[PDB]
Amino acid sequence: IVGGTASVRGEWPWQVTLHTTSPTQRHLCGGSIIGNQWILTAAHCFYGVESPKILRVYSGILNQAEIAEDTSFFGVQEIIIHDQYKMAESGYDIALLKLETTVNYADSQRPISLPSKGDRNVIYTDCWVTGWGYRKLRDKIQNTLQKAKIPLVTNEECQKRYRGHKITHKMICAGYREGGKDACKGDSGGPLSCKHNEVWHLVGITSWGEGCAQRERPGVYTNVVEYVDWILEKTQA
Numbered sequence: 001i002v003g004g005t006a007s008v009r010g011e012w013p014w015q016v017t018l019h020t021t022s023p024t025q026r027h028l029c030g031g032s033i034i035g036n037q038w039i040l041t042a043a044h045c046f047y048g049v050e051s052p053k054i055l056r057v058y059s060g061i062l063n064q065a066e067i068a069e070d071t072s073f074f075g076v077q078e079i080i081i082h083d084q085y086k087m088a089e090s091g092y093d094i095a096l097l098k099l100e101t102t103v104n105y106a107d108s109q110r111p112i113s114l115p116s117k118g119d120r121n122v123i124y125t126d127c128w129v130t131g132w133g134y135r136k137l138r139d140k141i142q143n144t145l146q147k148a149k150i151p152l153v154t155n156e157e158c159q160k161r162y163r164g165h166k167i168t169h170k171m172i173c174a175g176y177r178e179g180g181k182d183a184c185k186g187d188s189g190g191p192l193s194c195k196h197n198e199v200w201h202l203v204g205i206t207s208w209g210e211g212c213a214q215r216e217r218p219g220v221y222t223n224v225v226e227y228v229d230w231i232l233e234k235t236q237a
């Protein structure tokens with residue numbers, strides 16, 4: 001997260017940190033708890049990942065320093081990538097992690113509500129991006145979970161900033177015209193939570209962008225509301 005600040009512990013209880021044990025344990029991507037055995041994250045996060053056996057999901061984390069060899073984690077039973085996904089910049093950048101065990105909800109770890117198809121008219125004005133990603137282009141994974149409030153931008157506006165791409169209605173963008181605040185490397189798969197009517201909604205999933213926090217270059221997110229049916233199909237055994 002560029003231009004953000006340190007989060008308060010338990011502020012974003014749906015936020016989880018995806019870790020890879022190969023070669024040595026490390027932060028891979030972000031993710032969101034959406035059900036007791038389900039993490040919603042980005043498909044492109046699993047590039048090169050041949051098996052879920054090398055994955056560990058940590059919930060209720062503020063500082064990466066909380067994570068050691070003796071820290072409890074959730075194993076991943078299955079990675080579910082959208083069948084139409086080919087590359088973040090192409091859309092369909094969404095995936096589910098089915099956990100080997102169930103998450104015991106608590107003040108530090110609970111699920112975020114998915115947006116409803118009815119809410120596609122809602123004008124979210126209170127939206128935040130969070131993660132342990134880079135604070136700058138050439139940085140490193142951050143110890144403390146960061147947060148930044150970022151305004152949504154219309155798809156038409158976003159398309160203007162990415163004339164080499166196709167910003168579909170399955171994408172959603174957010175950023176300041178002048179830049180300064182944005183997600184960055186390592187935040188991928190993280191949630192774009194927007195507080196509407198005293199209720200947090202998972203509006204987007206951090207996906208890609210040209211650089212980080214650059215002016216006239218808003219971050220691009222998966223438009224979650226467009227995948228509610230897909231999520232329900234893959235989440236139902």
Ligand SMILES: *[C@@](O)(c1nccs1)[C@H](CCCNC(=N)N)NC(=O)[C@@H](NC(N)=O)C(C)C
Nearest residue numbers: 088183184185186187188208209211212219
């Ligand atoms: C993700 O955190 C990661 N993806 C793979 C490893 S870390 C990056 C988030 C970038 C967010 N940028 C922004 N809001 N401006 N995602 C990426 O780096 C993707 N590429 C780009 N060019 O963003 C990924 C497809 C390589």
